[PDB]
Enzyme design. Sequence first.
Site, mmCIF file in Angstrom:
data_model
loop_
_atom_site.group_PDB
_atom_site.id
_atom_site.type_symbol
_atom_site.label_atom_id
_atom_site.label_comp_id
_atom_site.label_asym_id
_atom_site.label_seq_id
_atom_site.Cartn_x
_atom_site.Cartn_y
_atom_site.Cartn_z
ATOM 1 N N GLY A 1 -3.016 5.068 1.436
ATOM 2 C CA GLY A 1 -3.123 5.884 2.596
ATOM 3 C C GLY A 1 -2.278 7.356 2.094
ATOM 4 N N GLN B 1 2.127 15.244 4.132
ATOM 5 C CA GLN B 1 2.803 14.620 2.284
ATOM 6 C C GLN B 1 2.259 15.692 1.452
ATOM 7 O OE1 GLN B 1 1.260 10.304 3.226
ATOM 8 N NE2 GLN B 1 3.156 10.437 1.759
ATOM 9 N N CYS C 1 5.780 4.051 -0.051
ATOM 10 C CA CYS C 1 5.470 5.493 0.334
ATOM 11 C C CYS C 1 5.465 6.398 -0.831
ATOM 12 C CB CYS C 1 6.697 5.887 1.237
ATOM 13 S SG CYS C 1 5.977 7.735 2.098
ATOM 14 N N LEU C 2 4.112 6.939 -1.037
ATOM 15 C CA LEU C 2 4.149 7.871 -2.259
ATOM 16 C C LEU C 2 5.144 9.219 -2.084
ATOM 17 C CD1 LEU C 2 0.227 8.369 -2.131
ATOM 18 C CD2 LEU C 2 1.546 6.911 -3.602
ATOM 19 N N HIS D 1 1.833 3.668 9.561
ATOM 20 C CA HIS D 1 2.824 4.389 8.350
ATOM 21 C C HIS D 1 2.189 5.886 8.306
ATOM 22 C CE1 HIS D 1 5.017 4.348 4.613
ATOM 23 N NE2 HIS D 1 4.001 5.592 4.355
ATOM 24 N N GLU D 2 0.918 6.055 8.388
ATOM 25 C CA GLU D 2 0.316 7.315 8.071
ATOM 26 C C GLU D 2 0.585 8.148 9.378
ATOM 27 O OE1 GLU D 2 -0.075 8.325 5.127
ATOM 28 O OE2 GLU D 2 0.160 6.440 4.332
ATOM 29 N N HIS E 1 3.795 9.624 9.580
ATOM 30 C CA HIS E 1 3.884 10.866 8.592
ATOM 31 C C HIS E 1 3.701 12.219 9.450
ATOM 32 C CE1 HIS E 1 5.227 9.630 4.595
ATOM 33 N NE2 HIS E 1 4.080 8.692 4.579
HETATM 34 CL CL LIG Z 1 2.180 7.281 2.088
HETATM 35 NI NI NI Z 2 4.028 7.141 3.200
#
Ligand SMILES: [Cl-]
Ligand code: NI
Length: 167
Positions: free
Chosen positions: A45, A50, A90-91, A132-133, A136
Amino acid sequence: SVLQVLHIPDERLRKVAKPVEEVNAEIQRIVDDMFETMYAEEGIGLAATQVDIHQRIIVIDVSENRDERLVLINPELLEKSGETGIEEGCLSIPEQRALVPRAEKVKIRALDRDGKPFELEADGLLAICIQHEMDHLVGKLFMDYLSPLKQQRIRQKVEKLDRLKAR
Ligand SMILES: [Cl-]
Ligand code: NI
């Protein structure tokens, strides 16, 4: 194009995304670049926040074969139920992890990539990834669910990793 993903402690990750006014050619390009970026980063995701675009746009693919694209533009949480939690990454917090409590089941409404409205009931990994997304988009990160000492350790580790990658 593959876009840059912001990493902690970048303050832009704390920005609250504005609703998309119209799903147009600009929005569709952002969606396509976000997929390219998510796949390049081997993520499941990604939120527009981000990639430093502060609009309510999420792309998701939780499938093993990486061929099930989901787009949430202007998602709204309609209901949630149950209790779950897995170790999440998480990226934006590269290589780190934490057990995060979540709702097991969620129902959302959103617009798709073509700007057509839809609703979705999700559970399992998909539901976890949606939450999660969506976090963000309101400037919230999985770190925020953790103790101060653990947050400090995570920030330090990401900072070291980023120095190392910075070459
Ligand atoms: Cl992420
Ligand atoms: Ni994340």
